């Protein structure tokens, strides 16, 4: 019709940059302070490849103590950004737990997902680009290197996810 709608969920360990990526997409601003999330939601209209879309984006908690809220957003969400920080190897190892829970909750092996390696503006890193690309290939999904600080790859991560859901629906 006139508009399409996509339910996107941003997931990953605490402090990797989920809120900063979302806020850079929606407000065109970089958040320097770390305000740990419980659960925030945004709705933003965009045009992706000529399609007017309303993106409903849920910005989730990385802190372990909010893990009981995962089942609900996993059932609802249509696509997931699996975010890790390239200087946080623990957050990269935690990606598998999120992908496994999504798979179990949605009872599906083809749920739209994108692996995101954030903080690409840093001068050093502990997770190699090849290591993250290798994991994303094992999942059959794209991997995007982003910087919420410089805005590099931010639209690429969210729009690649929208394109995957659009294709999934067909």
């Amino acid at each position: 019709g006139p508009m399409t709608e996509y339910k996107l969920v941003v997931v990953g360990a605490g402090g990797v940059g989920k809120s900063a990526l979302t806020i850079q997409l929606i407000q065109n601003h970089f958040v320097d302070e770390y305000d740990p999330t419980i659960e925030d939601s945004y709705r933003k209209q965009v045009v992706i490849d000529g399609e007017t879309s309303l993106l409903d984006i849920l910005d989730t908690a990385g802190r372990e103590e909010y893990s009981a809220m995962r089942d609900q957003y996993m059932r609802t969400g249509e696509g997931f950004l699996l975010v890790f920080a390239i200087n946080n190897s623990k957050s990269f190892a935690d990606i598998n737990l999120y992908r496994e829970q999504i798979k179990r909750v949605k009872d599906s092996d083809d749920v739209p997902m994108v692996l995101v390696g954030n903080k690409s503006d840093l001068p050093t890193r502990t997770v190699d680009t090849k290591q993250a690309h290798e994991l994303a290939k094992s999942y059959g999904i794209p991997f995007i290197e982003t910087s919420a600080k410089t805005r590099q790859g931010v639209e690429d991560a969210f729009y690649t996810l929208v394109r995957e859901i659009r294709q999934y629906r067909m």
């Binding site: 709608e5 339910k7 709705r43 309303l54 849920l58 957003y73 609802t76």
Partner: peptide, 8 residues
């Protein structure tokens, strides 16, 4: 268009 997408 859906009024409440997390709850045509």
């Amino acid at each position: 268009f859906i009024y409440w997408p997390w709850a045509c």
